[PDB]
Amino acid sequence: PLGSMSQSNRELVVDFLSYKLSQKGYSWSQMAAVKQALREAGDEFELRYRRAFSDLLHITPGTAYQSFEQVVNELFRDGVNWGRIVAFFSFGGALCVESVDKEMQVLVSRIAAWMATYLNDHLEPWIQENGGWDTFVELYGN
């Protein structure tokens, strides 16, 4: 269903303004400042470790979540930290890139939701006792 044409128009205005403030050393919100920090930790992660992203592995919509819920379980098998959370995110990005490489676009919407609910039910806790997101921003910003 379609929402407000004004909420649409406001959402873009609000996006283009944060970006300009983040560049000039400001931030619209804690959410805005965290997003950009993760975007850049991500590219930094991509750069440092491009080798390990290659062709990852019978990717079909069939056993997609199954094969997914297991890699992540294994990822944090013995604990969370700021680097594994980044390792976590960058992992979803390639899945989404490699998926649309097979028109399996339909797999992208589902992927997002597996992360959001995992990060909510499992990553969210750690993150919270360990300083918060504000703390990440400091370690990983710029």
């Binding site: 440092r48 990852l56 890699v71 379980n73 990822l75 680097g83 370690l139």
Partner: peptide, 23 residues
């Protein structure tokens, strides 16, 4: 197959964590 990859992501994601942790 997979398991080895999850392990790999645990590793490089630690080298990374180590980096910004040392800073």
């Amino acid at each position: 197959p997979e398991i080895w990859i999850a392990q790999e992501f645990r590793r490089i994601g630690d080298e990374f964590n180590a980096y910004y942790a040392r800073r």
